Amino acid sequence: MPHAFKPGDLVFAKMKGYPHWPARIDDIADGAVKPPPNKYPIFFFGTHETAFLGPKDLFPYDKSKDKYGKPNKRKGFNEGLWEIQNNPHASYS
């Protein structure tokens, strides 16, 4: 049975106006800005951007990849598909 989200988990993350996007739950570094309550820091592969999202917008990658893991015309998306498949836990800073 599933647990709550934790840093390192792999997802597709949904933002209004954007396709379900390859992403991870990030950690928060000592001294760094924390998310709002009930929100997680989401690192988007390919764009390397961060947004704060709740579980309603987070789809676990294993379950969802057959639906959402297909190329897309949007900037960064296909690089993001490579990252989540090939090195999802690397530093992209």
What was the experiment behind these coordinates? Answer: X-ray
Closest CA to 38 of 50, 54, 49, 20: 54
End-to-end CA distance of the chain: 33
CATH, range 10-86: 2.30.30.140
Cα separation, 14 vs 20, in Å, equals 5
56's tokens:
């309603």
Query: Any idea which residue has 């991870």 for tokens?
Result: 24
Spatial separation of the C-alpha atoms in residues 41 and 5, rounded to whole Å = 11
Residues pairing with 12 in the sheet: 22, 59
**What are the residue ranges spanned by the domains of the chain?**
10-86
Residues 6+ apart with CB under 8 A from 35: 28, 41, 52
Distance between CA 2 and CA 43 in Å, rounded?
21
Residue 14, CA atoms < 13 Å, CB-side half-sphere: 10
